[PDB]
Amino acid sequence: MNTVPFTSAPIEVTIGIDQYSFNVKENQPFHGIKDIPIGHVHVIHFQHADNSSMRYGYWFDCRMGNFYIQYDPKDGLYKMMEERDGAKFENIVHNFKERQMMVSYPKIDEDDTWYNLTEFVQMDKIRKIVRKDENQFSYVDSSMTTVQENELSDPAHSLNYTVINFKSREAIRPGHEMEDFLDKSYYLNTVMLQGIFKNSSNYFGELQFAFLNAMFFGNYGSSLQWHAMIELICSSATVPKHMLDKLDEILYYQIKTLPEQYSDILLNERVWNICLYSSFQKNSLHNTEKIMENKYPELL
Amino acid sequence: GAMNSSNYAELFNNDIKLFVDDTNVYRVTVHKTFEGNVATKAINGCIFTLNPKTGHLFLKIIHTSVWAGQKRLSQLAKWKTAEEVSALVRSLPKEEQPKQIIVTRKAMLDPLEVHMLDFPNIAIRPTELRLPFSAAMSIDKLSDVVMKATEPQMVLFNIYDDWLDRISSYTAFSRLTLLLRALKTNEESAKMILLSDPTITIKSYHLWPSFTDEQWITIESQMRDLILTEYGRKYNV
Numbered sequence: 001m002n003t004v005p006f007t008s009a010p011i012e013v014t015i016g017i018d019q020y021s022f023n024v025k026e027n028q029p030f031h032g033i034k035d036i037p038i039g040h041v042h043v044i045h046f047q048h049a050d051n052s053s054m055r056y057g058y059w060f061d062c063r064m065g066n067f068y069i070q071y072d073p074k075d076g077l078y079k080m081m082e083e084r085d086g087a088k089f090e091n092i093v094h095n096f097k098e099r100q101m102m103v104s105y106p107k108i109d110e111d112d113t114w115y116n117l118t119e120f121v122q123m124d125k126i127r128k129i130v131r132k133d134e135n136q137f138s139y140v141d142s143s144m145t146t147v148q149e150n151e152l153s154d155p156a157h158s159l160n161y162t163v164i165n166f167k168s169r170e171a172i173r174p175g176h177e178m179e180d181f182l183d184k185s186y187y188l189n190t191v192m193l194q195g196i197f198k199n200s201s202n203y204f205g206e207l208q209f210a211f212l213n214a215m216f217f218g219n220y221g222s223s224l225q226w227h228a229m230i231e232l233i234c235s236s237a238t239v240p241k242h243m244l245d246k247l248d249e250i251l252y253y254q255i256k257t258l259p260e261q262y263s264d265i266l267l268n269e270r271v272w273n274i275c276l277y278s279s280f281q282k283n284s285l286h287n288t289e290k291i292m293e294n295k296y297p298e299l300l
Numbered sequence: 301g302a303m304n305s306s307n308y309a310e311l312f313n314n315d316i317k318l319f320v321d322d323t324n325v326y327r328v329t330v331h332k333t334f335e336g337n338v339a340t341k342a343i344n345g346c347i348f349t350l351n352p353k354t355g356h357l358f359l360k361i362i363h364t365s366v367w368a369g370q371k372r373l374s375q376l377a378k379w380k381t382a383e384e385v386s387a388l389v390r391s392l393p394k395e396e397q398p399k400q401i402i403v404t405r406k407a408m409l410d411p412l413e414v415h416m417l418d419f420p421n422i423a424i425r426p427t428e429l430r431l432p433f434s435a436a437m438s439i440d441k442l443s444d445v446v447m448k449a450t451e452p453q454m455v456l457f458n459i460y461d462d463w464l465d466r467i468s469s470y471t472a473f474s475r476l477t478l479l480l481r482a483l484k485t486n487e488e489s490a491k492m493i494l495l496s497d498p499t500i501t502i503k504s505y506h507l508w509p510s511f512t513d514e515q516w517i518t519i520e521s522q523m524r525d526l527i528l529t530e531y532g533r534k535y536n537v
């Protein structure tokens with residue numbers, strides 16, 4: 001079990017750690033979160049009470065260092081930092097725990113949501129999408145645009161997701177225009193899976209990360225990326241059977257976890273109706289289809 | 301974006317552009333089988349690719365053999381159209397290649413865009429106009445060259461005959477669309493109008509009769525009457 005201490009909480013803020021959220025009042029004696037499961041990436045995120053604009057947060061893995069949060073009154077946000085002095089850190093954390101100034105990450109996984117949402121998400125891959133190599137953790141927020149969005153402006157602060165574009169030379173082999181556009185299997189399997197991602201685990205990892213950034217920060221370009229990566233699989237006639245079964249599980253837990261009140265802005269009607277009802281894989285996503293129909297039948 | 305009434309004069313500026321109409325690419329007769337089921341028999345078709353400024357119709361004849369052994373022919377027909385149009389652009393010198401291709405039906409947009417990926421600078425555009433190009437097969441000689449073909453074949457010719465010697469491309473296109481709209485609404489009547497006077501002939505290399513300016517005004521008026529007529533015969537007005 002690991003800990004992310006907080007120097008203090010000078011400004012009123014809703015804090016979230018994965019799918020959990022809680023409120024901290026202005027200058028309430030809060031000194032972080034403890035009992036954080038080792039073995040998964042995590043995201044700690046923030047929404048200031050006084051400006052709900054700019055949700056922002058940090059992806060991290062506690063195995064990669066000792067991390068804490070400290071408010072910066074100049075830049076106006078809660079910042080993640082690494083403490084390199086390990087003795088100093090254990091001491092701080094032990095005192096804060098003794099004083100019970102830390103909220104406890106629940107040891108109540110029954111609804112196995114975080115593992116299922118982050119199964120293929122690796123911190124090393126996150127750090128390639130979010131370039132800031134001096135830090136072991138990765139900052140994301142509502143407004144960051146993707147490489148593909150900037151093609152259609154600050155590159156250092158961009159989400160470097162893998163560019164998918166169904167009407168591109170990469171996607172369409174000369175001489176197979178109609179074949180490759182109506183059945184994207186070449187693009188998925190040879191270009192993307194074999195060529196760029198290397199394996200389906202890395203593909204699913206980016207898909208899951210894009211969804212999580214869309215859900216936790218309302219990052220629109222991440223939502224575009226999540227739907228693109230779904231649509232590329234659903235629009236391929238030839239997909240390994242193990243990828244389809246896993247995709248169905250991935251999407252099930254994403255739909256299960258999405259706030260009911262955010263379905264209007266985070267779910268693209270066209271992609272989902274296509275994928276569940278028109279695509280090659282229309283019959284291969286049983287769990288996802290059943291939850292979608294019972295929870296968001298209006299979308300469909 | 302799309303082509304409509306408001307930006308009509310762009311058709312006649314000096315940027316090379318083509319209309320592509322695919323409505324006569326895949327053509328069938330529907331008939332009953334001996335068992336009493338229904339079957340289609342394909343007949344030859346054509347892609348109608350028109351420079352509206354110069355009158356150049358790159359008529360690509362689609363022989364029935366191109367459908368042999370193929371499924372979902374109406375969908376393939378749009379991709380075949382796009383393949384042929386792309387091949388036509390590639391065959392033209394750089395300075396003759398269009399800067400825009402306007403498709404008369406929206407379903408052609410994706411097939412053409414995908415076939416034209418090599419030409420990022422050529423704009424593929426839809427239009428809001430209800431253009432009568434489907435009636436091109438009501439032009440006698442044009443129907444005859446398409447129905448006589450025994451193999452794939454391209455015919456380049458001016459669909460406006462020599463009219464541009466005497467009138468602007470705007471006026472020529474308006475005449476063409478009026479003739480084609482008439483032929484589409486009542487072919488027999490429209491053709492009767494065009495030929496009633498045997499002294500006005502069609503040059504061996506022309507589609508339309510050698511009308512004088514004054515006779516074209518009369519002709520053009522008679523085609524409008526027809527279109528209004530039929531519209532009353534249709535709606536009872």
Ligand SMILES: C=CCN(CC=C)C(=O)Cn1ccccc1=O
Nearest residue numbers: 017020021022033103104105106
């Ligand atoms: C301080 C409590 C925050 N907490 C754990 C986070 C560290 C949560 O479970 C968040 N949460 C979510 C649903 C219902 C109740 C609720 O508290």
Ligand SMILES: C=CCN(CC=C)C(=O)Cn1ccccc1=O
Nearest residue numbers: 441442445455457504505506507
């Ligand atoms: C005859 C009408 C238009 N057209 C084909 C007919 C459907 C042409 O070939 C026009 N044309 C051009 C150059 C030399 C000869 C010639 O006939």
